[PDB]
Amino acid sequence: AVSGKWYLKAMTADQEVPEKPDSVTPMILKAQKGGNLEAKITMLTNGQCQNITVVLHKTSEPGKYTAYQRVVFIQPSPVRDHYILYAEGEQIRMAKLLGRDPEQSQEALEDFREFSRAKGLNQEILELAQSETCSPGGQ
């Protein structure tokens, strides 16, 4: 049960991802029959809103899902109320800190940094601007 409302607080990649979001809404994880997960999030990118819907199909290995291209790994953080996503796919390796609370947390950042560097993800850690809604320029 990684289910419910999450805040996507940080991301990092093994490479340059020039699709930098300028802010993000909360991420919703809904549990569906079969143990599949539905992930909903909206991201502001260059004045537009990307409303994303990704189904994470369960697999044989526990904690691992498949999506898109990408295989997603989900595991808890040692820090209170934080979870870490680790993703390998189309090729990028990428990791995301999710937290139940939006307030910045140096401990979860520190461990997320410790988690990501031990996998070769050495690019910049971006802490994302949060907002309960995305609104495109002009709308």
> Across the strands, what pairs with 30?
38
Q: Which two tokens stand for residue 110?
A: 């520190």
Q: In whole angstroms, how far apart are CA 75 and each of 15, 72, 132, 138?
A: 22, 10, 25, 39
Instruction: Of 63, 71, 82, 11, give the one whose Cα is nearest residue 41.
Output: 11
Where would I find the beta strands (DSSP E) of 14-134?
Answer: 23-24, 27-32, 36-45, 48-58, 64-67, 70-76, 82-89, 92-99, 126-127
Q: How many CB atoms lie within 10 A of CB 89?
A: 14
Instruction: Of 139, 138, 132, give the one whose Cα is nearest residue 24.
Output: 132
Q: How many CB atoms lie within 10 A of CB 107?
A: 12
Q: What was the resolution (in A) of this experimentally determined structure?
A: 2.5
